[PDB]
Design a protein around this ligand. Sequence first.
Ligand SMILES: [Cl-]
Ligand SMILES: [Cl-]
Ligand SMILES: [Cl-]
Ligand SMILES: [Cl-]
Ligand SMILES: [Cl-]
Ligand SMILES: [Cl-]
Ligand SMILES: [Cl-]
Ligand SMILES: [Cl-]
Ligand SMILES: [Cl-]
Ligand SMILES: [Cl-]
Ligand SMILES: [Cl-]
Ligand SMILES: [Mg+2]
Ligand SMILES: [Mg+2]
Lengths: 226, 225
Amino acid sequence: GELAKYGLPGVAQLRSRESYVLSYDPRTRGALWVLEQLRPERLRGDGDRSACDFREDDSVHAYHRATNADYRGSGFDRGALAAAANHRWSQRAMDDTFYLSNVAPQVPHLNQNAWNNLERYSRSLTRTYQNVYVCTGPLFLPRTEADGKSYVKYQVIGKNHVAVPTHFFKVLILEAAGGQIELRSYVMPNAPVDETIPLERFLVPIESIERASGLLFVPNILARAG
Amino acid sequence: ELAKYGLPGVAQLRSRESYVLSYDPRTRGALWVLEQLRPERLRGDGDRSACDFREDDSVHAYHRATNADYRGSGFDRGALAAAANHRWSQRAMDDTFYLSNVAPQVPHLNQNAWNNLERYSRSLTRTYQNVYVCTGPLFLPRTEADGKSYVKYQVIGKNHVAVPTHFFKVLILEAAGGQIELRSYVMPNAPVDETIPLERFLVPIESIERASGLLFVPNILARAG
Ligand SMILES: [Cl-]
Ligand SMILES: [Cl-]
Ligand SMILES: [Cl-]
Ligand SMILES: [Cl-]
Ligand SMILES: [Cl-]
Ligand SMILES: [Cl-]
Ligand SMILES: [Cl-]
Ligand SMILES: [Cl-]
Ligand SMILES: [Cl-]
Ligand SMILES: [Cl-]
Ligand SMILES: [Cl-]
Ligand SMILES: [Mg+2]
Ligand SMILES: [Mg+2]
């Protein structure tokens, strides 16, 4: 009827970029998830860019838009979700990974070491799988406190209150030569992670990522396999 | 072929008989619930026992608040679209008892100041042609002794249902001629003193928009044109 006469206050904010598609959460001022399709034939190239040349996303309303000022002085890196080095195959592809809508505040040690390693390993799977789908996003995990109750606590940085994830997830969909598809899901804390711990140790059941993140992967995958 | 395996997280709009809702599976709660109150719809024989809430089976069980999440938590199942807005139809009233329409609410707040705000909003149908009501949770930051800002909120039950720190209610007041007035309230999820006049909880709509991630004024301006 006439219920939506004045519109709806919010709807899904999908963004298609050259290198990824993301879903944006204006409450946290960051993406819910970012989706990439890596493959060996559309991976390497001449693209390059300064490691620090990130840009705020003018397609996001200013009330809900993360800025470089939000990160300045916070002690966090602008941690990209869709990695720049996945997309040197075109300058525009690589540039799009520097929208702040594709980054979250990331402990610098993590960004530089164990997360970097995981991104590098993910890229390397294109040498032995036809396609490597990568879905990357934040987590805000509850913890139990000494009063016996459970709470979600996270920092928010800058005037725009950009949320600092407690953890990050990364889901790989590995398309092997002809048909057979394999699923690998990792979680790391937003913390200095020992770079020598084997990445295997950070695998988790996909369902626990689904539960915590509010997202669903397995049903879409079973649906595609039919 | 980027979407070959679908997208893992898109808007969960739900249309019910009494309201439209947008759902957050992360917090296991609505982002907002939108109603249109009119004087006829207040009246009706609809009734329902005050505690008869049902889990929403249109929500994946991983992300679905249940009655057991609330049991023993010390919080009420605080409805967002109020049952009493919808006595005009038993089905309309029934739909307000889906848990997707509720958030953990301090019992005192649900019973007193929030109830009063709901009764007041209902009463504006006597003097406005339409009363639109958008209700939802807030999770507002706080500044700790280190000068940094954090969001902290409890989660209750096995399904970790988020306990909002505050609630917002936006009224769109539509007169015939002279037209549209906007009025927006915020209350902490706390035992608010019921003698505090409701007007003292008015906040600028921009502050709700900033904190909630939602936009109201752009849509309001577009319809005026
Ligand atoms: Cl910029
Ligand atoms: Cl940085
Ligand atoms: Cl990179
Ligand atoms: Cl604390
Ligand atoms: Cl944090
Ligand atoms: Cl595509
Ligand atoms: Cl039930
Ligand atoms: Cl049951
Ligand atoms: Cl209750
Ligand atoms: Cl009621
Ligand atoms: Cl506020
Ligand atoms: Mg990085
Ligand atoms: Mg109530």
